[PDB]
């Protein structure tokens, strides 16, 4: 179901330091973050490094390009600014910085905003001015998820933060989901009608429990661009004074996005740093550790 197509390691480096990836708008090219805070563009088929930019003073943890190719979000590890927004048209340069947000995402329908996470707190920013439009936090409703990531829903009208559903327009909390794990705060399903919070699938129409999916415990997920398949990989799991470990284990799984039934389990026999698919879902790129950190990017054909 996943045929190896290409593999490459980081050019000009004793130990290869790829940490995360996303395809760029320009097609045979993948953007990769590295453990030295650099952003690199690579031809996924030849393995040729095409460009390199210094973005942060610590390792890149996560990145996200805008759908129109003009903008890029990055997040680092410990150095401030923890996240940044980069202009990609013409000269690659920093447009805005989010100095304390460990994680950021674009809004989804209209990509005119950024949502940042700082611990339990969500910040919503305007892309053009960089101004903080909203802070969302309520200490009575907080779940204190250790890996909380705030996120917009598909139509940008709702936010999930620390397991609390927020109405953006009114800046009001409309529902707190109970805490059933220590780490994962949950995401919106692309259909806009349910949320996936660790092993719990909650209906947004009623807040009833639609599904128990035990294989999603401690998982980050991403969907194909039609919203019909979901990829899931399990966080590795435990003080920033340690050597660099891969965020994920050695396997990912695909699920039917409508009923959460398993499709495939893929054990690559190496710890996983990141994975992504292209807008057409022809290709899957996975950052995999050889074996100490020494990563390669492996490109697979999506069958």
């Amino acid at each position: 179901a996943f045929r190896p197509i290409s593999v490459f390691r980081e050019a000009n480096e004793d130990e290869s330091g790829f940490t995360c990836c996303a395809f760029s708008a320009r097609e045979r090219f993948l953007m990769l973050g590295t453990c030295t805070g650099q952003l690199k563009l690579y031809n996924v088929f030849s393995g040729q490094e095409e460009a390199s930019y210094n973005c942060h003073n610590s390792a890149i943890t996560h990145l996200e390009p805008s759908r129109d190719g003009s903008l890029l979000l990055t997040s680092a590890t410990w150095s401030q600014p923890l996240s940044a927004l980069w202009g990609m048209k013409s000269v690659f340069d920093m447009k805005h910085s989010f100095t304390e947000d460990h994680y950021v995402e674009f809004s989804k329908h209209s990509q005119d905003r950024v949502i940042g996470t700082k611990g339990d707190i969500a910040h919503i920013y305007d892309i053009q001015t960089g101004n903080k439009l909203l802070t969302l936090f309520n200490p009575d409703l907080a779940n204190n998820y250790k890996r909380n990531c705030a996120t917009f829903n598909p139509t940008d009208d709702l936010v999930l933060n620390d397991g609390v559903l927020w109405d953006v327009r009114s800046a009001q909390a409309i529902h707190k989901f109970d805490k059933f794990n220590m780490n994962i705060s949950g995401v919106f399903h692309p259909n806009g009608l349910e949320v996936i919070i660790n092993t719990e699938i909650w209906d947004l129409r009623t807040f009833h429990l639609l599904h128990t999916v035990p294989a999603l415990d401690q998982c980050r997920v991403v969907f194909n661009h039609t919203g019909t398949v979901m990829y899931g990989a399990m966080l590795q799991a435990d003080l920033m004074e340690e050597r660099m470990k891969s965020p994920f284990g050695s396997s990912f799984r695909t699920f039917n996005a409508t009923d959460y039934k398993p499709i495939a389990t893929i054990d690559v026999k190496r710890n996983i740093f990141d994975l992504c698919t292209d807008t057409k879902d022809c290709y899957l790129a996975v950052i995999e550790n050889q074996g100490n950190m020494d990563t390669v990017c492996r490109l697979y054909e999506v069958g």
């Binding site: 003073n57 410990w78 150095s79 401030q80 003080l239 920033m240 004074e241 340690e242 050597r243």
Partner: protein
């Protein structure tokens, strides 16, 4: 040109994680070590014999320091505190709370009535040893603080930061009295006053050590050849015999330079991971080195000059 002949005498095993800092007691009798394993250990400086373990920090310790009379220790921990310890009893006398993130570096003043600390939180704090209270919080830097040190008479503090600056502080007033920056501003990963108080020795994460006339803001000496781009490696003046500069290195060697001529005079091999800490014995030509998570040992070396 005379060269030292440091040779390995003992390997001290016992910590179960990276060893962050080794320090000889001022009276020359003891070596104290701190570790990511949350423990402080005391060893015999001349025989390397384990003496005792001191415990209480809840997370890793990155630094430890002796009081002038060799009776007290202070330690700086990722648990956001420092602790003052009575060494002979092993008991925690005070826990210094106030930093909002990991405490990376600490030192007593020579008078032993003050402790200076530096933190990931970008501040330098001065604490009352006897009350355990923070006397001053200095907004020292705009990035994490990697080292702090009193000068010989305690009137000055020097601090170094990832912001690329070394800064000198008036102990009494807390006023910054000097900002040292040269041709670039790579992170300053280590700094300390020279024994005579006239100079500072500063490490930057560009594989470089620099001896500074901080009064005149002039760099007098530059030492290179080692590897140092990532870790905050402690360096030293060796003054018991020849006048050397000593530092660990990310290629797992101890480097020793001629202070005046800047040439490498010895490289000590043996460790199996970054040599992140070195210390020079107060009266004999003895060096302690300590290495990170894939080594976990301290080593004692002795030279005829």
């Amino acid at each position: 040109p005379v060269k030292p002949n440091y040779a390995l005498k003992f390997t001290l095993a016992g910590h179960t994680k990276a060893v962050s800092s080794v320090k000889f007691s001022p009276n020359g009798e003891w070596l104290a070590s701190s570790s990511a394993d949350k423990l402080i250990k005391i060893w015999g400086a001349y025989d390397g014999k384990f003496e005792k373990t001191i415990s209480g920090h809840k997370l890793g310790i990155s630094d430890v320091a002796w009081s002038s009379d060799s009776n007290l220790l202070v330690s700086a921990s990722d648990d956001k505190t420092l602790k003052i310890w009575d060494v002979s009893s092993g008991k925690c006398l005070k826990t210094l709370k106030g930093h909002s993130n990991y405490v990376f570096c600490c030192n007593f003043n020579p008078q032993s009535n003050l402790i200076v600390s530096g933190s990931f939180d970008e501040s330098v704090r001065i604490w009352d040893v006897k009350t355990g209270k923070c006397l001053k919080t200095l907004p020292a830097h705009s990035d994490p603080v990697s080292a702090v040190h009193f000068n010989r008479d305690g009137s000055l503090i020097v601090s170094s930061s990832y912001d690329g600056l070394c800064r000198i502080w008036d102990t009494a007033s807390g006023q910054c009295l000097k900002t040292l920056i040269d041709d670039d501003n790579p992170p300053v990963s280590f700094v300390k006053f020279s024994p005579n108080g006239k100079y500072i020795l500063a490490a930057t994460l560009d594989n470089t050590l620099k001896l500074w006339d901080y009064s005149k803001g002039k760099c007098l000496k530059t030492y290179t050849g080692h590897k140092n781009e990532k870790y905050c490696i402690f360096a030293n003046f060796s003054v018991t015999g020849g006048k050397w500069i000593v530092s660990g290195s990310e290629d797992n060697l101890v480097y020793i330079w001629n202070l005046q001529t800047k040439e490498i005079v010895q490289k000590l091999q043996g460790h199996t991971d970054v040599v992140i800490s070195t210390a020079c014995h107060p009266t004999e030509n003895i060096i302690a080195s300590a290495a990170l998570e894939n080594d976990k040992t301290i080593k004692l070396w002795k030279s005829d000059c």
